[PDB]
Amino acid sequence: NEPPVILSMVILSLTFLLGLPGNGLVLWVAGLKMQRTVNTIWFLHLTLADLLCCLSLPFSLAHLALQGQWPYGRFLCKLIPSIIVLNMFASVFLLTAISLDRCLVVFKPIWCQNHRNVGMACSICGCIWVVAFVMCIPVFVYREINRCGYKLVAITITRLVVGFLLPSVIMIACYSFIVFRARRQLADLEDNWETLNDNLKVIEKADNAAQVKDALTKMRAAALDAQKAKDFRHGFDILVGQIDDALKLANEGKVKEAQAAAEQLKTTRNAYIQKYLERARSTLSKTFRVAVVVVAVFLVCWTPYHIFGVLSLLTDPETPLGKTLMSWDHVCIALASANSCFNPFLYALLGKDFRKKARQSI
């Protein structure tokens, strides 16, 4: 009995029990009900990787319960950890590719509209699986049995380089760029709303036609700018039409009628502009929270594993520090495998249409 061993067993059991049925249901809904799109392919691949990773959790529990003693042949001892590493690398690369695609669809929309299809998604998923198998090959090669394991530095170095540094950096950069672009769009919308409001504040008490028409032209320019940021388009068209009517009324020397037409804009403003501004703010808050939670979960799940993998080479196993690292390696791998259960709750279960399909499925 050992507290780290019991903790690892409990974490693995909870991960399995919370991941297997959920991932199974998500995969079933995405395969049998959801239409065949690119995001559907990504979700299917992620759920398949998570299911293949969770199916070996009983084997990990059986191995840990025997206190390392593996009576089976060398075949399983070389196969199952290689399969675990394969699933982990596949999931990491799939998440990185999903982040890259979500960044590219906002960065260059024309290139994605003209090139992004299902064939490219299948090809990049195949390339991801090939790279994962290449990274898994040395695990299956160097593993040997009784205690299943090894008897190494460059392997851990290239693993930290390819599987942890570059994917995490790419994901962080993509999420940061998306957040910055969304915040810039919200700032532009808020500036347009402020230019619409501050000039009406003086139009409501103006006493000259030149300032009125200048402020109305500024309002029209701000509305045309915000239109490129559905009932939204109809409301902006009505707003621009009423602004044009106010301009036509002001050019004829009617200052009071122009002020009345400008004050009439408050109805459609409070009807459409405020509602859509609140909707955009809520959407930005939601996507920012989602990105932050995903990044935090990925870091918490994949940082201690690589930290301990690096420290294993800089610490002698005979020293008490090496024994402590070897004992907590189980907890580290359990926390890393918990990401396989945390994946569907942060990628697939957030879509509104997907949530509705999953609810109607039950």
Epitope: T217, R220, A221, K248
Partner: antibody
Framework: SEVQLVESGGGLVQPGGSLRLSCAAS????????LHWVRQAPGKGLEWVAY????????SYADSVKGRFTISADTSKNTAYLQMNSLRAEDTAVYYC?????????????????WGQGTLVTVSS | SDIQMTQSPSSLSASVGDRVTITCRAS??????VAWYQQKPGKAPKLLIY???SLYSGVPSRFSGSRSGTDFTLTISSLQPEDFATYYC??????????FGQGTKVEIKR
């Protein structure tokens, strides 16, 4: 045929006096597209002159032509008319007629998709 | 007051096949309400690009437009013996806000 705009007010005049430029459209109805005028001096750039709305009645003129020119339209024969008075040496240019659309739709964002033949208005003196 | 427009490339020389860049600046926010026109000596002008983002029908795809804040850029990838003419820019934010640029002329080097 396609959209075509023809002018018939070309010629020479005296300092001041009066002149009437005509703009006939073919291939579309003038009740649904607004007609404007653009000047172009020989060896100079373009300059907006005036705007007439057939289905709205509102008119507009440039800052340098207010109180001197008049613009109108006729939906019977689909013809625009520009009455110019008190002409000077600055008004000697080639007038061009164009059509810009209405905001409820795509033709608004479109540029001057069809230009006229151009009518030369010069002051003899 | 009227929205002023300044066009720095009044005249530039280039060769056949070379790229041409034309920059334009507005007085205040126009919201991409700037179009381009091509006029040959002795003929009526014709449009090539509207809103600095969409290409009009019948116009070759060599011309492209870009917008950055209040600045506009017209790019020609490769010149042809049939497009050497004058280029003008027009603001069409409103009916009573039409304003034209100074014009851009192109010539062939020898």
């Amino acid at each position: 045929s396609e959209v075509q705009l023809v002018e018939s007010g070309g010629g020479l005049v005296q300092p001041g006096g009066s002149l009437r430029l005509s703009c006939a459209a073919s291939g579309f109805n003038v009740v649904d597209f607004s007609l404007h005028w653009v000047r172009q001096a020989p060896g100079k750039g373009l300059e907006w002159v005036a705007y007439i709305s057939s289905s709205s009645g509102s008119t507009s003129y440039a800052d340098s032509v207010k109180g001197r020119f008049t613009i109108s339209a006729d939906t019977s024969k689909n013809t625009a008319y520009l009455q110019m008075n008190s002409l000077r040496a600055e008004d000697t240019a080639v007038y061009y007629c164009a059509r810009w659309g209405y905001w409820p739709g795509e033709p608004w964002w479109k540029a001057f998709d069809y230009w006229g033949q151009g009518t030369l208005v010069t002051v003899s003196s | 007051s009227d929205i002023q427009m300044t066009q720095s490339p009044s005249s530039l020389s280039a060769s056949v096949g070379d790229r041409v860049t034309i920059t334009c600046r507005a007085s205040q926010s126009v919201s991409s309400a700037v179009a381009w026109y091509q006029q040959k000596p002795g003929k009526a002008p014709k449009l090539l690009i509207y809103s600095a983002s969409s290409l009009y029908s019948g116009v070759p795809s060599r011309f492209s437009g870009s917008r950055s804040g209040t600045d506009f850029t017209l790019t020609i990838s490769s010149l042809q013996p049939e497009d050497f003419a004058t280029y003008y820019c027009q603001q069409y934010l409103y009916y009573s806000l039409v304003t034209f640029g100074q014009g851009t002329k192109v010539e062939i080097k020898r």
